[PDB]
Ligand binder design. Structure first.
Ligand code: BNG
Ligand code: BNG
Ligand code: BNG
Ligand code: JKE
Ligand code: HG
Ligand code: HG
Ligand code: HG
Ligand code: HG
Ligand code: HG
Ligand code: HG
Ligand code: HG
Length: 396
């Protein structure tokens, strides 16, 4: 049929499309304001909400009618989203074009490779997931310099939108699970089977993981935007604080592959719980390390490592608990937690800071959420593997 590393390249393409989506708004704040900063950020808020919710229908549709159709619809929708975002005049115009259309298309791109790629790597599920999610830490390294080039803004929307449409159409074009029979390899039994979606959705462990995903995502999104202002409040220059926090991008991208590889070799739960614990420690430690370039860098690298790991390790966990046949539907549901979090978290962090005027409230709230997540992730072990009596009774 085809070499099983191609779905990795596909997930990389799709997720890199998605990372470009996530990166664009940051470069658009100054150009758009040139023609309120909060008023712009509402478009990114809608983008995060629509993306995170639409993974759910994208996952159900991928499981029902295959991932090719969904990734390609998402590519057309996101391409239209960006290209129409270029021909805008109002704020509501941007909300619609970028927040809704683009978020819809991007979510439909994002989910199906995460579900599909591991099916090709039953030997390396987490690493395959990682390739399907690693593009989201690559948007900067590809788009950023060229973005600055073309700005020095409508052109960035139009041209990047075309490029993303093409990458998503290619990534979806060649994307599909392995054929039903053969799995890519190199007295009566007791036949088990993967969980159905209705069975997993009704499982309590699913909702404990859901809660842990919400906590981790919410903490990261509530503080990440504040790291550099923490540094400037401690006496650093804007440029020095900014340099320091920028290392976070490197660690956020690398963790998606590295954690996947690591938990493939040794297992998920304790490493994942360790990453959560370390994130909790970082939310507290910033008050001691955050006032110097080297210290603020260490905190940024740790936070990024932990945060990014979430997006390989939650699907890897979900895959371990319930199996791969319904991974589109199960992970589509579960990601809606990061959907709600990306909607509301950044706003909450800003509001707590303003309320007290200080970074104690958001950082300690985020440390509490990561503590809850540590407990949930560490104590939650996989559920009973299901018994397939309706197949078991075929053996004479
Ligand atoms: C934003 C953080 C909130 C995460 C936790 C949300 C709990 C929502 C309730 O879940 C319910 O649990 C039952 C079994 O436990 C299921 O049978 C039922 O179908 C499901 O609706
Ligand atoms: C900054 C912290 C980095 C993570 C270091 C913790 C690695 C955990 C290794 O323990 C292993 O975990 C597996 C279960 O998941 C099992 O094989 C077994 O219980 C144990 O051998
Ligand atoms: C002195 C004021 C209180 C400080 C310590 C408690 C912080 C309570 C803020 O609530 C926040 O609201 C979000 C709403 O979605 C939830 O995610 C979550 O429960 C929590 O992060
Ligand atoms: O990895 C993701 O998919 C993500 C989702 C929502 C917000 C930020 C990110 S970085
Ligand atoms: Hg957002
Ligand atoms: Hg988005
Ligand atoms: Hg976290
Ligand atoms: Hg999210
Ligand atoms: Hg708090
Ligand atoms: Hg909190
Ligand atoms: Hg809460």
């Amino acid at each position: 049929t085809m070499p099983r590393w191609v779905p990795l390249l596909l997930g990389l393409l799709g997720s890199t499309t998605c990372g470009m989506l996530l990166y664009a708004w940051s470069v658009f704040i100054k150009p758009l304001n040139a023609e309120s900063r909060a008023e712009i950020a509402m478009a990114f808020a809608i983008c995060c909400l629509i993306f995170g919710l639409m993974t759910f229908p994208a996952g159900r549709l991928s499981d029902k009618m295959g991932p090719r159709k969904v990734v390609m619809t998402g590519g057309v929708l996101l391409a239209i989203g960006f290209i129409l975002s270029g021909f805008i005049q109002s704020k509501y115009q941007l909300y619609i074009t970028y927040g809704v259309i683009a978020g819809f298309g991007g979510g439909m791109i994002y989910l199906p490779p995460i579900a599909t790629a591991p099916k090709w790597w039953p030997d390396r599920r987490a690493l395959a997931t990682g390739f399907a999610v690693v593009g989201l830490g690559l948007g900067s390294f590809l788009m950023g310099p060229l973005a600055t080039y073309i700005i020095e803004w409508r052109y960035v929307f139009w041209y990047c939108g075309v490029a993303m449409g093409i990458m998503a159409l290619i990534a979806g074009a060649f994307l599909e699970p392995p054929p039903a029979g053969w799995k890519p390899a190199g007295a009566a039994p007791k036949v088990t089977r993967d969980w159905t979606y209705e069975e997993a959705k009704g499982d309590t462990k699913f909702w404990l993981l859901y809660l842990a995903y919400f906590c981790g995502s919410f903490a990261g999104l509530m503080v990440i935007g504040h790291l550099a202002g923490f540094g400037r409040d401690a006496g650093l220059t804007a440029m020095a604080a900014a340099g320091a926090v920028s290392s976070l991008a490197f660690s956020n991208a690398a963790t998606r592959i590295l954690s996947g590889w690591f938990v493939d070799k040794i297992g998920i739960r304790v490493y994942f719980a360790a990453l959560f614990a370390l994130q909790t420690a970082a939310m507290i430690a910033i008050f001691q390390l955050g006032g110097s370039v080297v210290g603020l860098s260490i905190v940024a690298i740790v936070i990024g490592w932990n945060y990014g790991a979430m997006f390989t390790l939650f699907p890897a966990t979900c895959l371990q608990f319930y199996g791969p046949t319904a991974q589109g539907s199960n992970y589509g549901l579960l990601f809606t937690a990061c959907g709600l979090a990306g909607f509301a978290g950044p706003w909450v962090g800003g509001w707590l800071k303003d309320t007290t005027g200080t970074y104690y409230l958001p950082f300690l709230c985020a440390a509490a959420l990561c503590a809850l997540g540590t407990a949930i992730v560490f104590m939650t072990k996989p559920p009973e593997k299901k018994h397939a009596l309706e197949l078991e009774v075929l053996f004479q």
